[model samples]
Target: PNWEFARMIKEFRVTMECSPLTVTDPIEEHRICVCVRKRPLNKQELAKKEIDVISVPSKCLLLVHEPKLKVDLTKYLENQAFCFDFAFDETASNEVVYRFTARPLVQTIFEGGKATCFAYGQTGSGKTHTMGGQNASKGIYAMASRDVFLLKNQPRYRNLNLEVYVTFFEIYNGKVFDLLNKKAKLRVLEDSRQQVQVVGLQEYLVTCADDVIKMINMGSACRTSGQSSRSHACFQILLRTKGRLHGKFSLVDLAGNERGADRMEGAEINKSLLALKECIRALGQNKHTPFRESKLTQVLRDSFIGENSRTCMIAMISPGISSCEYTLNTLRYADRVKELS
Candidate 1:
């Protein structure tokens, strides 16, 4: 795991159909359009965009958003030879629920190297909705679960052996609690490879899609329920798997960051928030920063930078105008993360 297979992918901008409305006075109305762009483009594009661009390594994979509803991606991605896919919205009971699903390209990325999908955004943003759709609807989690089973179901691949382990935890007040663990407390530990682990948390070894579905349901049931002034509660669920040899993939769902004024809490909530900030700070600081100080970062130490892992982050944002500040902060964080080795 000492070997680093890391590269900073080119950032792309994605624009949604809806724009936020801002009011300046009783008679004045202003509308702001939302646009998300990936950072560090080539010299030519950088000049065109008129933004200071960070230089990314040539090996890095760049995923850019094509503004046109129908895109000729082949021409756009001519220089980059990697798979691509789009996020689709899933609705339930004729009502819109989660906002997106993983594209088939996600699996292709996993096969090429390490693959990840995370929801990023403000409180009440669609991170959870994107990662974990309404019940059994078509979210990334459900889709990945199905992909695993479908691969196993192939007649020629039936003989292949696969082992999948899942760990679900939440950063509350800064402490990491295993959503799958009933125990009130758990300890964090690291293996010889410098990988972090929880002492008493449960890691289910899954084989079939049914097993994954059951584990997901069980983990959801064990999640904490409390009224905090904070409008959103973020949790991260990690999936790690090992096959016959040394092969693995890690998928995580990060918790959203909220302002202290917005969150209501006693000692517990405060601690959780502090821990989360510390973990994120370390990530922003790069591998030299100690990740083991916090349980959340400790468990992800190996995947940060130096280790042999390919990481991908999906930054979620609030579509509402009121959340513009938070959305900008999240995008800035993602931009900083683009520099990690």
Candidate 2:
């Protein structure tokens, strides 16, 4: 045991206590929403006797208590606070997260607008669990599927002869593969109309909610697995009429943020991640967005820069003191996204 570190952590917790998360009322909608979600300490962290360093005193506010030692070995707490559109604690359900972050986008599709949602965090931080869920009906994708079909059958939309299509793909080590097409390699290209397209990607025409779930499950099974995911997986839901695209919703599960740390696979992930942030920052500032900087940005070009587009990002983190470094980096990135407004 690292008695030296544990002792300071023990003394720090006594002065600072974390309050449980409480629901706040009236979350007004916006074009871009940035949210932070905290997950409970896992079995490994608990086995190490790690304490939680994060506290949510209010719905939109979070505080992180960082333990420090003086030159003479005195213990102190360096507290930092952050604000977000929503701060979900460990007790929050997937349904609750979906309601605040994704459900609004379902209606946007019917109105011929593009909406995008992202899950970004370190490995094993519940990114897949939050987006894919325990089974078909429990995750955000399934919930959105149900909502889309419910809206599609409404009298207003029913007369529009609308149809839904789904596509899934993965980006691994700077290469693109079609998850729904048996991991076949695909290429990203810009058409004559300045539209980005994934050539050789297969799209499934879904007629019912069940059809969408089957495809989601199929593509998820093809996702890369190891000590950590080595790729970023993207799923798309497209609304079309008479073979013309009307609206689209993109769900992206970003690769682990730590994969780019002085490793052989660092180049591609680092490039894409940096490009993504720059594009978003440019979009927020109403400047020229460099979507051509990376393949990931090219595929997501529409979502970042269109009058009829909406974006929401869910930054996931573990509450254990051991992970506070990674947690702090995540929160700072999320805060930068919020700072745009």
Candidate 3:
């Protein structure tokens, strides 16, 4: 079966090379760009002899080879195909993913535009690893901080009098908590202008990557005691000049979408996912965006409704056969978002 699938994959890749699977250049120009990133099997999965079922045939195409059984007890391969703005295979590095997913958003914020880059996947599928980093490789948040500061310090941007500010927080069980403020409880409110605001959430001014790193570390220390699969962690970078806000960049690491035996947590996941989908649908159609149903949506209001805002949804997935179900779920969610656009 392994050799057969390998041969099939080789043929698919050859066919892909013969034709053009063009991806959007300067993806930020579009309001919403959805990407899929598949990670290689981890150590435990490798030891268990779990095979990979996902394949990236081109820059924008992915296929899942699902094994099925027939009435005669015959094993058959049912290949599922999907398309996204970018489909990253196992060989793609964190840096490469950042370049295509979040880097453009950094530029958008610098140019006085709102942008967001968020990861959606099941737990242990590499959401935290992609957003916050695991070891030597830096995550998208760190890379984004560096780019924002680098652009801020440049003479051209410096002359614009840009001031960088950041806030980090997490939502658990439908409540918001400030990660940067010692886990203080926070509230989401709508101001006079009909904009959503995080009341009492402290936004610290930052100058370089080190400043961002310090704040992240501080938040990490506080969250370690309470972090769970049900929490939705968000970090935002604001670009301001002369005490007036111009643009904002949000980096959100969403709660895992996997269903669990715990009914309460499973229900929470459903609500959040539904709210997010509705918000994106509203945004795509330029209709009224709904934020009241979920705290995650309230905090991500800008990402969903602003005319100057752009969003990039990076759906993370595991390549191991054990995670085939979760991978398909993640891809379907991502595909739906693309259809909204």
Candidate 4:
């Protein structure tokens, strides 16, 4: 609930709270990259008097104002701008962020491209707010699921048999648990084709927006019904005509924290770990690579291996100086992703 109600709109004139905002960038238009999204200061941060050191003046840029602390007690502010493919300010709503970032992934999927959009951030930095908000009106999962459903049944794809299947799972403490299947323990194994597989996973075939929504709710409920940990998964929508598959579109959510069992609880909580992972992957130079170091990294690997699959990380950040270290970590992570380019 970091979203703030502005003074102007406090008692009058309307706004874009639920409105969609489109964004584009040269870097993102053609390649894989990480983008940062700064959510508006919520009631909590404001109550704590946390400074909003982040600024988003353009789609391709956003900078952090860091106060340099000195041993002599002298303080000065410093500006560090990290260039991303696209960046959104705190004002950008859920719909706005999706339209700008995730919507493009949908187009790519419709065009036979495989892509994954995941949220990365410290705990309570709005990963849940931005990815799977309280309801259909608030998160990327709700928006993307609905949006993809629309394109699937559109006139252009009318001749093709559209089959969408969704499954929700969480990786907890180096193990995978299927949320859609009574919290059953699951295993990750690579198939003959080197494709990762979640053994004994249940797949729900969705035919419409509501179908997807239902499954999402079920999975979410199962997880939190017990007040579960944060987790992520990849769901696919398969296209076919005359019993022949045409294309498969997949969507994944990577939880920065899976609290229970502490499997990967801090994967997204500690930005430093992610920054190093970014350097290793973006450089694409390591073999015998220790992706096994963290399950989240393994999750990261599965999203990136496809020669045709592209990734867009919605680097969620905290606007508070309290989160300055984590914020810089995320920016530094994006910086490395771009430096290799």
User: Which is the leading candidate under lDDT?
Assistant: 3
lDDT of 3: 0.80
The count of residue-pair clashes in candidate 3 stands at 0
Sort every candidate by lDDT, greatest first: 3, 2, 4, 1
C-alpha lDDT (0 to 100) for residue 110 of candidate 4: 62
* Candidate 4 segments exceeding 4 Å error: 1-29, 227-246, 257-303
Alpha-carbon RMSD to native, per candidate: 15.5, 7.8, 6.0, 9.4
- The prediction achieving the highest TM-score against the true structure is 3
Q: Tell me the spans in candidate 2 whose CA falls farther than 4 Å from its real position.
A: 1-29, 224-228
Per-candidate Cα lDDT values, in order, are: 0.42, 0.79, 0.80, 0.62
Candidate 3 collision pairs: none
Model 1: residues >4 Å from true position, as ranges? 1-114, 134-136, 153-160, 191-193, 224-246, 260-293, 305-307, 339-341
lDDT by residue (47-99, candidate 4, tens digit) is 98888888887666678899797889899889976656667887888887787
**What is the per-residue lDDT of model 3 for residues 90-138, given as tens digits with 9 covering 90 to 100?**
9998898988788877877877888888899988877888888823127
Model 2, CA-based lDDT: 0.79
TM-score of 3: 0.88
- Model 2 residue 82 CA deviation (Å) reads 0.7
Q: What is the lDDT of residue 190 in candidate 3?
A: 78
Shift of residue 151 alpha carbon in model 2, Å: 1.1
The lDDT of model 1 is: 0.42
